[PDB]
């Protein structure tokens, strides 16, 4: 069941910059950093449903 | 449910035999998971189902039935054919939406065999050539744009060649 | 296209008659550069500047349609073979293609099973 | 990296004094290649090819007939890249 | 309800003062266009009626939204245009505008075939008014005799058509009365009678020849680029070839065959010539011709699948084209000549409306759908049932849809403007409005375009 | 002429080194095959594969 | 084709075992028996050119 | 322009030389060879020769003439960086800055204002300069240089003295 659950978070967590781009909130020079973070916590979300299929 | 066709039953029971390691850590994370966010978003689902309390009834969908159909008005007539029309129009709607079941029903047929697919099933590939065949001669699929009276020029056509095959042979 | 090697250092007059006409071509070239540079180095301008060899370029596009062609050659009736020519050509390809499907809905079914498209 | 003008004249006087074609004594600043220096003519290419390529290699042609003091070509290379503010 | 708000916008632009003016007209129509939208929407299970027939109702008409969409858009366009001139012109010429918007509420809400068309040839004359006066460009009024010298002649058959059938065959009047069709039995009669219902909306739906009609009308713009939208609402004025097609003649369609092959030609050698020329509005213009050939390809082969992708194309094309306009108009307004080559270079200046300058550019290829996909796909999968060759000439049309919008943006972005000393304001608040206004309904219409392609849907 | 050692180029490399390194390891190893032809010609198909590399 | 070796390795697959790497006997069994799969054609493909061999002589 | 055809020409054999090449002993190696070959036969004064010498000079630097030249750094055009990393912002736009926000950084705007102020009372004097060095009609190819300047402002400078950079 968490499984269906957890795999549109990686497609969630991608989008997130693009929802709040347009001023949101006030970040100069973090919003490449950003980027960086949505990625590396979207790769742990991705690795997870992945030992799911194996199993 | 009911309309739906679904699996029989569901199966997979855990075995942990081989090794030890750290167990399964993908059941580890299932037991996790469904106490820190699983929980949490059941409660609040309670919670706004507990908040709903009076709700509206909301009688459906509305009947209406017959009204004498296109072929046993004849003549020309304004007044008649109008809900004539209406009724093969209701009909096309709901014959429209009658393949998108079965459609779907094959869209589980694959998922739910998977490694088989083609071998098995057998009854969902045999009702689905049951119906689009139907659907096919009778309603349109080579009448153009939908039209009530060229459906009854259709199925004339349909019925004179049937009748002068059925004589030779 | 061209044919032999690249032009950059072929075929050219040994310092002859060209070098009084080839000194001709920087006389007209700083003649319109003088003008654009005046109208250009002032504060003042706000602008952009009209530059006839553009306007003209324009017009030679957009305009020049029945002043010229008033002669109608058979160069242009060559032309008219490449106009209406692919017009009438698709007419021995749609037809074959179309008959050729029509003879296989009545006799020799072709039709397909599970259409319930158009 | 940054470019500054004592650094245009130490870069380009080092790359021709390297040369070995012209006495460290003969040419310094001001001393031109065409008459002064003692270069030839194929020399004066083979000079603006050799500074280009150790600074930052971008000298048309048609410049290549207006550089030929090395005071002049020390300030075309600053004038093209931009340097010294 | 759509009889009487814009008859009394009429007076609204007479009876304000002179400091006004603008905003009266603009507020008082927004609020008309959120009643559109309210109210039209609704269908049962077929076409219903709004009243008796003076204004009908909608069959396959989210057109009309459209048009009430671009009711106020019109008026935000011509804001830098008609700023120096008299006061009573300005009440002169909204009303001119109004007056177009009125009778095109009428042709789309109108089922009739004989009230439709006197009022389909009254938009004829406000345009011819719109472009012969306040034309930038010279030799205006080639722009102004060739708009009624190709339509009229075109349209005039009509009259001996229409009401030909209805001396025959009961009356066109109700359209949902006429169901008395009888099949053509194709006839050397009944060819011309096909030829005069088909060739009035030959001129206004550009094929490959009798084409001439739409770029002259753009080139001498009516206004700078800001009544061209107008020009875009006439490029869609031509939806009776929805309803003559499947109303008077089902049968007889063996006629409609060398006409898919006219525009055929019409998608591939008019789009070859956009490509060189010069002119920004005219590679709007020769693009537009391509767009709408694809409605004249579909609407003949009458498959129910191709009525889907033609009403979505009807949409896509006059929110699409109309915002390129808006561009051209923009570029336009600070260097007062539409050369592409003088015109160069975006985000030196311009560094919003380069962003605007994609949304609109890569919409008339086919993007993550929007309504233009949903539009061209539906077509090209309707044409393949009709003949298997389609894609093939179809395909090169793919190819040169990338060199519409990539060889606008290149000729852009290339950054020098070394001559240009103007264009320093970057944009107004009313200039950006129009990139938005025109673009967020498409952005909106990507997430359920159900009530845009709706013939039975 | 100089090149310097970034501390975000290091990171990020060294990180995929792990990627290139354990990659045929972890991911062919763990993944459900589907008929296996490796079995005949040695010499002919199998060693020459290595060879041509070498060669 | 085997079957019955190869149900040993998806059997093996089936405990979970993070990190799968250590289970080489159920693997080397699958392969023993697609060997005597591959033998078994390549002595068919031996036999028919036995056959052809004993053809083109009588 | 004989002088130049030969210069030219030579210009384009050292730095075509090195894509042949692989290192840096080998470009002297044959460099040398290269002047071996023209020092030799520009000694001596030839009308017709020296034209003919220059137009078999086109062999050989066509024989070897494309293994895709070594135009390295930033050259105009060919290939890596012509003309990039350029925002190049023009002084046109430095003018049309924003109140509430043309405040930040008042030395940038104050000195501006001194050199649109230098231009404005010195183009007066630039057109009367410029306009008089004229030989008759239209200019003879070339710029006009500053002659009788007392003051300062050679005439015709704004986009020559105010390049944006690289």
């Given at each position: 069941?968490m ?11 991608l989008?997130?910059?693009?929802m ?10 973090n ?13 742990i ?11 | ?79 008649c054919?109008?809900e004539?029309?209406?009724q093969?129009?209701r ?7 009658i ?6 029903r094959?869209?589980?047929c ?7 697919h083609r ?5 969902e ?8 065949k ?36 | ?7 950059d250092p ?8 060209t070098?009084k006409?080839?000194?001709?071509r ?26 006839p060899?553009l306007?003209?370029?324009?017009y030679?596009r957009?305009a020049?349609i029945y002043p010229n ?5 058979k160069?242009?009736?060559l032309?008219?073979?490449?106009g209406?020519?692919?017009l009438?050509?698709?007419y021995?390809?749609?037809?074959t293609?179309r008959?050729?499907?029509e ?16 | ?11 380009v ?8 074609k ?9 001393s031109?290649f ?21 600074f ?8 290549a007939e ?13 004038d093209?890249k931009?340097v010294?503010? | 309800?759509?009889?009487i708000?814009?008859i009394?916008?009429?007076?609204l ?16 129509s ?6 559109s939208?309210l109210?039209?929407n609704?269908?049962?299970?077929n076409?219903?009626?709004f009243s008796?027939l ?7 008409t ?12 019109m008026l ?8 120096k ?5 300005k009440?002169?010429?909204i ?6 918007q ?5 042709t ?6 004989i009230?439709?068309?006197?009022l389909?040839e ?7 008014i ?5 034309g930038?460009?010279?030799?205006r ?6 708009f009624?010298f ?5 349209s ?21 009365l006429?169901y ?16 005069a219902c088909?060739?009035?909306?030959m001129?206004?739906?550009p094929?490959?020849?009798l084409?001439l009609?739409?770029?002259k009308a ?17 490029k869609l004025?031509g939806?009776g070839m929805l309803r003559?097609?499947?109303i008077?003649?089902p ?7 060398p ?5 055929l ?8 010539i956009?490509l060189?020329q ?16 694809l ?5 003949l082969i009458?498959?129910?699948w ?5 009403t ?6 006059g ?11 923009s570029n ?8 592409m ?11 919003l ?9 890569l ?18 999968m309707?044409?393949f049932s ?8 179809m395909?090169?049309?793919?190819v040169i849809?990338?060199?519409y919008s ?12 070394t001559?240009?000393i ?5 944009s107004?608040?009313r200039?950006?409005?129009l990139?938005s206004?025109?673009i ?5 219409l ?6 845009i ?5 | 002429?100089?090149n ?5 180029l290091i ?6 080194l ?6 045929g390891?972890i ?9 296996i032809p490796?079995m005949?010609m040695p010499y002919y ?7 041509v590399?070498?060669? | 084709?085997?079957?019955?070796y ?5 059997k ?15 693997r ?6 697609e060997?005597l799969?591959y033998?078994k054609?390549?002595?068919?493909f ?13 | 322009t004989?002088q130049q055809?030969?210069?030219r ?12 090449c ?14 071996a070959?023209?020092?030799?036969h520009?000694?001596?004064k ?10 078999e000079?086109?062999?050989?630097f ?12 930033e050259?105009?055009?060919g290939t ?5 990393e350029?925002?190049?912002?023009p ?7 924003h109140?509430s ?8 705007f104050?000195k501006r ?18 306009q ?22 050679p ?12």
């Amino acid at each position: 069941n968490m499984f269906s659950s957890l795999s549109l978070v990686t497609l969630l967590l991608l989008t997130m910059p693009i929802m709040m781009m347009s001023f949101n909130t006030y970040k100069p020079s973090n919003y490449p950093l950003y980027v960086k973070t949505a990625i590396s916590y979207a790769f742990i979300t991705s690795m997870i449903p992945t030992m799911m299929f194996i199993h | 449910x009911x309309x739906x066709x679904x699996x029989x039953x569901x199966x997979x029971x855990x075995x942990x035999x081989x090794x030890x390691x750290x167990x399964x850590x993908x059941x580890x994370x299932x037991x996790x998971x469904x106490x820190x966010x699983x929980x949490x978003x059941x409660x609040x689902x309670x919670x706004x189902x507990x908040x709903x309390x009076x709700x509206x009834x909301x009688x459906x969908x509305x009947x209406x039935x017959x009204x004498x159909x296109x072929x046993x008005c004849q003549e020309k007539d304004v007044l008649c054919m109008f809900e004539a029309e209406m009724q093969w129009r209701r009909d096309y709607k709901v014959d429209q939406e009658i393949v998108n079941i079965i459609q779907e029903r094959l869209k589980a047929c694959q998922q739910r065999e998977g490694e088989s697919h083609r071998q098995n099933c057998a009854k969902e590939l045999e009702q689905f050539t049951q119906v689009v065949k139907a659907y096919q001669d009778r309603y349109x699929x080579x009448x153009x744009x939908x039209x009530x009276x060229x459906x009854x020029x259709x199925x004339x056509x349909x019925x004179x060649x049937x009748x002068x095959x059925x004589x030779x042979x | 296209s061209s044919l032999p090697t690249t032009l950059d250092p072929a075929e050219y007059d040994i310092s002859s008659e060209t070098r009084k006409a080839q000194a001709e071509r920087l006389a007209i070239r700083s003649r319109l550069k003088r003008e654009y540079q005046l109208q250009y180095y002032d504060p003042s301008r706000r602008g952009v500047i009209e530059d006839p060899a553009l306007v003209r370029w324009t017009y030679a596009r957009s305009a020049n349609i029945y002043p010229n062609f008033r002669p109608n050659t058979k160069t242009s009736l060559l032309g008219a073979l490449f106009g209406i020519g692919p017009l009438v050509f698709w007419y021995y390809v749609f037809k074959t293609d179309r008959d050729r499907k029509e003879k296989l809905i009545q006799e020799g079914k072709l039709d397909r099973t599970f259409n319930i498209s158009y | 990296p940054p470019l500054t003008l004592e650094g245009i004249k130490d870069r380009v006087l080092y790359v021709l004094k390297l040369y070995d074609k012209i006495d460290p004594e003969k040419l310094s600043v001001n001393s031109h290649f065409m008459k002064d220096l003692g270069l030839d003519s194929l020399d004066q290419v083979e000079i603006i090819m050799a500074m280009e390529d150790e600074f930052g290699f971008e000298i048309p042609d048609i410049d290549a007939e207006k550089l030929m003091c090395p005071q002049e070509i020390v300030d075309y290379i600053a004038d093209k890249k931009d340097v010294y503010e | 309800k759509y009889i009487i708000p814009t008859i009394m916008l009429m007076p609204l632009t007479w009876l304000s003062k002179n400091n006004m003016i603008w905003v009266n007209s603009t507020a008082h129509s927004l609020l008309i266009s959120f009643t559109s939208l309210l109210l039209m929407n609704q269908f049962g299970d077929n076409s219903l009626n709004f009243s008796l027939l003076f204004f009908s109702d909608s069959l396959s008409t989210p057109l009309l939204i459209l048009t009430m969409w671009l009711l106020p858009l019109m008026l935000m366009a011509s804001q830098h245009h008609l700023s120096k001139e008299n006061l009573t012109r300005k009440k002169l010429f909204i009303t001119m505008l109004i007056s177009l918007q009125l009778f095109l509420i009428m042709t789309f809400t109108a089922m009739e075939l004989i009230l439709f068309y006197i009022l389909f040839e009254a938009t004829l004359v406000p345009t011819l008014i719109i472009i012969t006066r306040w034309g930038n460009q010279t030799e205006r009024l080639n722009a102004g005799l060739y708009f009624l010298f190709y339509t009229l002649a075109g349209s005039l058959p009509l009259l001996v058509a229409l009401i030909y059938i209805q001396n025959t065959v009961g009356s066109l009047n109700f359209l949902m009365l006429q169901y008395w069709v009888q099949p053509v039995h194709n006839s050397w009669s009944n060819v011309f009678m096909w030829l005069a219902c088909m060739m009035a909306f030959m001129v206004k739906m550009p094929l490959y020849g009798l084409h001439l009609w739409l770029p002259k009308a753009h080139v001498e713009a009516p206004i700078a680029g800001s009544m061209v939208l107008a020009a875009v609402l006439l490029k869609l004025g031509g939806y009776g070839m929805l309803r003559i097609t499947l109303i008077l003649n089902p049968m007889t369609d063996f006629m409609a065959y060398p006409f898919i092959m006219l525009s055929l030609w019409g998608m591939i050698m008019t789009s070859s010539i956009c490509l060189r020329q010069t002119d920004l509005k005219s590679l709007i213009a020769y693009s537009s011709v391509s767009h709408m050939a694809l409605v004249i390809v579909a609407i003949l082969i009458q498959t129910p699948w191709s009525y889907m992708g033609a009403t979505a194309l009807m949409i896509a094309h006059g929110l699409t084209s109309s915002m390129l306009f808006c561009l051209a108009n923009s570029n336009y307004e600070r260097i007062h000549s539409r050369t592409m080559i003088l015109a160069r270079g975006l985000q030196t200046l311009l560094p919003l409306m380069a962003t605007w300058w994609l949304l609109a550019s890569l919409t008339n290829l086919a993007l993550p759908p929007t309504i233009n996909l949903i539009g061209e796909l539906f077509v090209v999968m309707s044409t393949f049932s009709w003949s298997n060759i389609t894609i093939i000439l179809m395909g090169v049309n793919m190819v040169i849809t990338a060199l519409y919008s990539l060889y606008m943006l290149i000729m852009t972005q290339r950054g020098k403007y070394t001559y240009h000393i103007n264009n320093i304001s970057p944009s107004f608040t009313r200039e950006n409005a129009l990139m938005s206004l025109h673009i967020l309904p498409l952005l909106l219409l990507t997430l359920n375009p159900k009530i845009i392609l709706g013939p039975l849907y | 002429n100089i090149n310097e050692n970034n501390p975000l180029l290091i990171n990020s490399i060294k990180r995929l080194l792990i990627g290139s390194l354990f990659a045929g390891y972890i991911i062919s190893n763990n993944i459900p095959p589907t008929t296996i032809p490796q079995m005949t010609m040695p010499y002919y198909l199998k060693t020459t594969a290595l060879i041509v590399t070498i060669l | 084709y085997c079957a019955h070796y190869l149900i040993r390795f998806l059997k093996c697959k089936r405990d979970s075992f993070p990190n799968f790497l250590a289970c080489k006997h159920e693997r080397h069994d699958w392969d023993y028996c697609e060997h005597l799969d591959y033998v078994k054609r390549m002595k068919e493909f031996e036999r028919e050119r036995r056959l052809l061999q004993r053809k083109k002589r009588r | 322009t004989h002088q130049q055809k030969v210069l030219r020409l030579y210009k384009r054999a050292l730095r075509h030389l090195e894509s042949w090449c692989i290192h840096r002993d080998k470009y002297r190696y044959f460099a040398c060879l290269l002047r071996a070959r023209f020092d030799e036969h520009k000694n001596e004064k030839d009308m017709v020769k020296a034209t003919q010498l220059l137009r078999e000079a086109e062999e050989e630097f066509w024989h070897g003439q494309h293994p895709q030249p070594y135009i390295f750094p930033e050259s105009p055009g060919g290939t890596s960086y012509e003309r990039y990393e350029c925002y190049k912002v023009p002084e046109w736009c430095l003018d049309d800055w924003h109140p509430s926000e043309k405040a930040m950084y008042p030395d940038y705007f104050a000195k501006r204002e001194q050199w649109k102020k230098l231009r404005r009372e010195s183009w007066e004097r630039e057109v009367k300069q410029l306009q008089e060095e004229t030989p008759v009609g239209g200019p003879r190819t070339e710029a006009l240089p500053p002659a009788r300047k007392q003051g300062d402002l050679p005439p015709l400078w704004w986009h020559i003295v105010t390049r944006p950079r690289e």
